[PDB]
């Protein structure tokens, strides 16, 4: 017998079975396997296609609406104006010349409220990029940084 060899091959730690099982008792595994699981499609679904939907959950409306499929290009334009819009233009002449002989006088709303909601691709999508950086930078929205005195009312 000898007391070198006695300790690596004698208080050699085998309890450890009892803590690798307490790990795994109730099985955390279970309910944190879903909790790192659901962190993977927020982070490789909603940052990849939209987060399980896509246009509308797969069809959206008929079969897929005119923001997946490139139904032209901008979705706005071909299924707006160029094969919707002509056929009541050319059909009746007052569906689309209602809105377009219109615009001149209707640009008083369409350039106030339209500002927001037509133009919020760039107006309310960025949260500041038409009613701070653009048309309102000069005072017309920038009231707190150019309207320090408020002398433009």
């Given at each position: 017998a000898t007391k070198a060899v006695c300790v690596l091959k004698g208080d050699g730690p085998v309890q450890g079975i009892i803590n690798f099982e307490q790990k795994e008792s109730n099985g955390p595994v279970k309910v944190w396997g879903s909790i790192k699981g659901l962190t993977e499609g927020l982070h490789g679904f909603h940052v990849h296609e939209f987060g399980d939907n896509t246009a509308g959950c797969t069809s959206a409306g008929p079969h897929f609406n005119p923001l997946s499929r490139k139904h032209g290009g901008p979705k706005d334009e071909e299924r707006h104006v160029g094969d919707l819009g002509n056929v009541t233009a050319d059909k009746d002449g007052?569906?689309?010349?209602?809105?377009?002989?219109?615009?001149?006088?209707?640009?008083?709303?369409?350039?106030?409220?339209?500002?927001?909601?037509?133009?919020?691709?760039?107006?309310?999508?960025?949260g500041k990029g038409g009613n701070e950086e653009s048309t309102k930078t000069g005072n017309a929205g920038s009231r707190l940084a150019c309207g320090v005195i408020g002398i433009a009312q």
């Open positions: 007052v569906a689309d010349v209602s809105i377009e002989d219109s615009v001149i006088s209707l640009s008083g709303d369409h350039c106030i409220i339209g500002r927001t909601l037509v133009v919020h691709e760039k107006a309310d999508d960025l």
